[PDB]
């Protein structure tokens, strides 16, 4: 039971260990070492083989297997830190809540831990990309600090809205598509414009934030599993994408010398991955924004109760990471910002396309618009790269508009009003 807690909760001693451990990890000459570990996610690409002419980046992104792969990725780091003497499991940075201040652990450049009394840079703040010549600190340009601009009510946040919807789906696959996209937002928000950062598929693993974020994402995934148990579906069992689950995920499958870790190696099959307990680590709490698991299930049914309209996007697979903004325009020509989502990617990325639609709830906008499902309105989308350069439309398919009336309002008055 290694415990993963909120980064904020962490003790100075807890922090102490992580800082020292990561710093030592950075130094680690071994294949288990940090620089080597980073290469797992992206460049240098290891996937086809460690030494192969054409190499692809290890991203089982855009796939059902995606959470499992990343789940192993986190533990790989966690086990590494433990080798370093990490006292606890990698902490999670809950993006879901709005955050005026960015996490101090990662943010501060220098760390003056009181025990040593010495001052050193915060290994968590950044890393250097050795193989890439850029011997620069993994730069994050959180150009959009805007993340802290949550809603006034404060509970409802973009992340929350997005995440809650993901929670609603029973199907694992359906869940993952929504789940994964929500995941992408943090990558873009931190990385911003910077060439070597969270924003890029290649570079992102280098930044230490990556681990913290994935820890949170993994945490939410765990949350979903718990909800499923409540549903009665077995949490471990996945019905969907059985074929992918069986396949082992590299480089985890590639054991030594590249992967010293035995656990991940044995665990490489994603089927095994679901029971997180197998990697002995747990989270202090499994809850989403204060709602009990039971509460969550009850609430979701209520959400259905009202009519909702969504736009569906088929994600074909982009090139480099890009963010898309779409708006609904009336025949009159009025147009309102519908909403946005982003996709993480790089050249190295293996090809991927979603099996299903990615729903986004247009309803609020249309309601203000006082537009009906029947109404003829057009949706326009603009895709922008990290740079801010505009990307052409034309290849991009148009989204569908779906109307979700309240369907099976399963209820009786047992909830307190």
């Amino acid at each position: 039971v290694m415990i993963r807690k909120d980064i904020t909760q962490l003790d100075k001693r807890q922090q102490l260990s992580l800082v020292k451990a990561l710093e030592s990890m950075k130094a680690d000459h071994s294949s288990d070492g940090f620089q080597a570990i980073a290469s797992f996610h992206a460049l240098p690409p290891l996937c086809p083989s460690p030494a192969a002419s054409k190499r692809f980046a290890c991203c089982v992104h855009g796939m059902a297997t995606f959470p499992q792969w990343h789940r192993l990725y986190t533990v790989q780091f966690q086990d590494s830190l433990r080798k370093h003497g990490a006292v606890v499991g990698l902490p999670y940075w809950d993006w879901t809540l709005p955050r005026s201040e960015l996490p101090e652990l990662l943010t501060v450049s220098t760390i003056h831990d009181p025990e040593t009394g010495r001052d050193i840079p915060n290994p968590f703040i950044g890393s250097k990309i050795e193989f890439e010549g850029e011997n620069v600190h993994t730069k994050r340009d959180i150009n959009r600090d805007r993340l802290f601009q949550g809603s006034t009510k404060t509970h409802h946040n973009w992340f929350i809205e997005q995440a809650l919807l993901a929670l609603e789906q029973t199907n694992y696959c359906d869940f993952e598509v929504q789940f994964e996209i929500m995941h992408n937002g943090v990558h873009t928000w931190v990385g911003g414009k910077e060439p070597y950062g969270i924003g890029h598929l290649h570079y992102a693993s280098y930044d230490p934030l990556f681990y913290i974020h994935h820890s949170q994402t993994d945490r939410i995934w765990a949350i979903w599993q718990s909800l499923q148990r409540f549903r009665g579906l077995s949490g471990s069992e996945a019905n969907c994408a059985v074929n992918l689950m069986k396949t082992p995920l590299k480089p985890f499958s590639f054991g030594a010398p590249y992967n010293l870790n035995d656990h991940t190696h044995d665990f490489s099959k994603p089927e095994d991955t679901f029971d997180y307990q197998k990697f002995g680590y747990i989270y202090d709490t499994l809850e989403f924004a204060g709602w009990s698991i039971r509460g969550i299930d009850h609430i979701v049914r209520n959400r259905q109760e009202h009519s909702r309209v969504f736009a569906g996007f088929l994600l074909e697979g982009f090139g480099t990471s890009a963010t898309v903004d779409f708006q609904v325009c009336r025949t009159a020509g009025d147009c309102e910002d519908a909403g946005y989502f982003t996709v993480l990617g790089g050249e190295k990325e293996m090809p991927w396309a979603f099996d299903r639609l990615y729903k986004y709830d247009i309803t609020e906008t249309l309601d203000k618009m006082n537009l009906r499902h029947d109404e003829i309105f057009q949706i326009e989308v603009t895709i922008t790269s990290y740079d801010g350069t505009v990307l052409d439309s034309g290849l991009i398919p148009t989204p569908s508009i779906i109307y979700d009336p309240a369907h099976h309002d399963i209820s009786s008055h047992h909830l307190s009003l």
């Binding site: 083989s49 030494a51 192969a52 002419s53």
Partner: protein, 624 residues
């Protein structure tokens, strides 16, 4: 390392000494041997000793180097011990795989696996590793390719697998670079497995017995008017036959349209096999198909063969006559004379230009160019060695007859259309049969040692059951192995199996006679690349006096599948060199002129420099 290898090399010399062979002497690679080896020859280096030593000939004498080895032994085996040991090895028959080594790029490692083609189910994955070899090479190295194949002994693995030699398996190889970059395997040719042939009284499983001789193939000249008459009629009827068995359809089998891969294939390729040992099998099958047609036609006799070898004053006339006035009936065109190309809707130049006058004066009666070439082929004991020589001679007829005309015998695609094609192949088939007969005299059976893997594969389109082949018989002997025993399966015979009127026994003794004579040959590596071409070669002296060495030709078309001879083609330089009185060792330039059928000049770059091999004289052997 090199000291050891050099030591081993010395050991080999020592063993040769045990052989009582001149360890120093190196008959092969004469061209290279004379070449001095730089930079040693360059003499930038201080040591003059090496400079003198630069010729490799000198290199053999280690003693000149004046360095000795304490002992020359291999793995604790005496040189006597080694020799005795090797003898035992030869005792057992073995199976080997031949590998061509391109040897290009950086150093690379290759692995070969013989897998069992069987795979009923579940994304099958079962196979074993045959063995591997390595190659060394830098990025800037002179391009080199092995002239000869490198054999490996499969037998151990095969037995280990439990697969008997008699088993259907395929093999594949993988190449890995030192850098680790994968190399394309597709470029590499499939290695062939060879099994040790057993050569004795009956090599195939069928019983050839004293043949009844229902269908006989006779030479055109022997054919009488009556015989020719039936043939003319049969061919005429045959060409008329629109059916698949019909002539037009039959023509397609050889070349365009290329049905071979499939009637529907992304890459259509000419079905006919050329540049392969399979080559005689396919053609032999081809002739039968036409022949089976003739019988349906009602032809009394099998397809006649135009013995090209015999000198010919002119065209036989049966083929030549444009119009045949039997006068029994009404005059018509001679079906033998020409055919039409329906698809191109062009007319074949059946009246092909015979630029070269085949009519050739003989040193003595029978001796002729074709005879010499053909005879040479016959000399070779090896089927594969024979095929190369045999095929090339075969090519000459096409080039000569077709000439410049694009649509004709000269073209691979077109050749099938000409009716001469049948006549020539019949003869060629005859020679093949003659060779087998000669082998029989040699007491060399039908069993073929070479191209075992090739023999197993069925030859299309004959194999195609569902696509167009009417003849069941051809379908039956799709496999080339079956092809060898023509008499039993095909049930066709030849009036005489003689070459030049030489009895089989006589020819065998005759071959021995040529052996006694000194002969230097020029070897040409022929990877026949494009459209057919004729090549004439002459040897230039320092004097810059040149004499024409001789000529050979290759047939090909764009459609033809890529092929390359494993072995070199040999031609006999000797007479010319003698006249020049140039020594083999002497430095003489060799110039080759490659002329396209079109007649456009072809760059010499196409052909690599030919090697010169000198064959010293042996004693006269056996005679009946």
């Amino acid at each position: 390392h090199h000291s050891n290898v050099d030591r081993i090399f010395a050991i080999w010399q020592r063993l040769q000494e045990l052989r009582n062979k001149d360890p120093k002497a190196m008959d092969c690679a004469q061209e290279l041997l004379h070449q001095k080896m730089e930079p040693f020859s360059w003499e930038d280096n201080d040591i003059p000793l090496t400079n003198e030593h630069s010729t490799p000939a000198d290199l053999f004498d280690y003693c000149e180097l004046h360095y000795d080895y304490d002992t020359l032994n291999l793995n604790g085996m005496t040189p006597e011990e080694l020799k005795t040991y090797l003898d035992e090895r030869s005792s057992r028959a073995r199976a080997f795989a031949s590998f061509r080594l391109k040897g290009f790029g950086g150093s690379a490692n290759v692995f070969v696996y013989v897998c069992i083609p069987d795979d009923n189910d579940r994304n099958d994955d079962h196979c074993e590793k045959a063995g591997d070899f390595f190659v060394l090479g830098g990025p800037s190295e002179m391009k080199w390719q092995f002239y000869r194949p490198y054999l490996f002994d499969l037998s151990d693995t095969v037995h280990k697998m439990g697969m008997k030699l008699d088993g259907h398996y395929t093999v594949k190889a993988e190449l890995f670079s030192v850098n680790g970059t994968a190399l394309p395997d597709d470029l590499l040719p499939h290695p062939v497995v060879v099994h040790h042939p057993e050569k004795g009284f009956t090599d195939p499983p069928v019983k050839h017995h004293q043949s009844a001789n229902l269908l006989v193939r006779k030479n055109i000249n022997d054919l009488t008017r009556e015989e020719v008459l039936n043939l003319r009629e049969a061919f005429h009827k045959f060409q008329e036959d629109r059916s698949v068995d019909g002539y037009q359809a039959t023509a397609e089998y050889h070349g365009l349209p290329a049905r071979c891969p499939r009637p529907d294939a992304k890459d259509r390729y000419a079905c006919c096999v050329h540049g392969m040992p399979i080559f005689p099998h396919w053609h032999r099958l081809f002739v039968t198909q036409v022949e089976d047609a003739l019988v349906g036609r009602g032809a009394t006799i099998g397809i006649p063969y135009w013995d090209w070898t015999e000198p010919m004053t002119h065209i036989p006339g049966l083929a030549g006559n444009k119009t045949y006035v039997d006068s029994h009936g009404a005059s018509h065109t001679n079906p033998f004379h020409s055919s039409v190309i329906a698809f191109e809707e062009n007319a074949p130049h059946t009246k092909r230009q015979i630029d070269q006058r085949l009519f050739k004066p003989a040193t003595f009666g029978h001796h002729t160019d074709l005879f010499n070439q053909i005879l040479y082929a016959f000399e070779q004991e090896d089927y594969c060695d024979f095929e190369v020589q045999f095929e090339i001679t075969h090519n000459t007829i096409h080039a000569w007859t077709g000439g410049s005309e694009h649509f004709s015998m000269s073209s691979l695609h077109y050749t099938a259309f000409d009716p001469l094609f049948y006549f020539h192949h019949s003869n060629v088939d005859r020679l093949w049969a003659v060779w087998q007969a000669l082998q029989m005299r040699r007491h060399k059976p039908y069993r073929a040692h070479c191209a075992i893997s090739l023999e197993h594969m069925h030859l299309k389109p004959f194999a195609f059951s569902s696509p167009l082949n009417n003849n069941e018989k051809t379908h039956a002997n799709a496999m080339p192995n079956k092809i060898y025993d023509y008499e039993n399966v095909l049930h066709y015979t030849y009036e005489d199996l003689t070459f030049g009127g030489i009895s089989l026994e006589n020819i065998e003794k005759m071959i021995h006679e040529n052996q006694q004579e000194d002969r230097i040959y020029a070897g040409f590596l022929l990877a026949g690349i494009r459209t057919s071409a004729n090549v004439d070669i002459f040897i230039k002296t320092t004097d810059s006096v040149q004499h024409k060495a001789g000529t050979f030709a290759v047939l090909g078309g764009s459609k033809e599948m890529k092929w390359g001879f494993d072995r070199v083609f040999k031609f006999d330089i000797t007479h010319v060199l003698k006249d020049l009185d140039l020594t083999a060792d002497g430095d003489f330039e060799v110039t080759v002129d490659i002329t396209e059928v079109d007649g456009t000049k072809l760059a010499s770059s196409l052909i690599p420099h030919a090697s010169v091999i000198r064959e010293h004289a042996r004693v006269k052997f056996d005679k009946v």
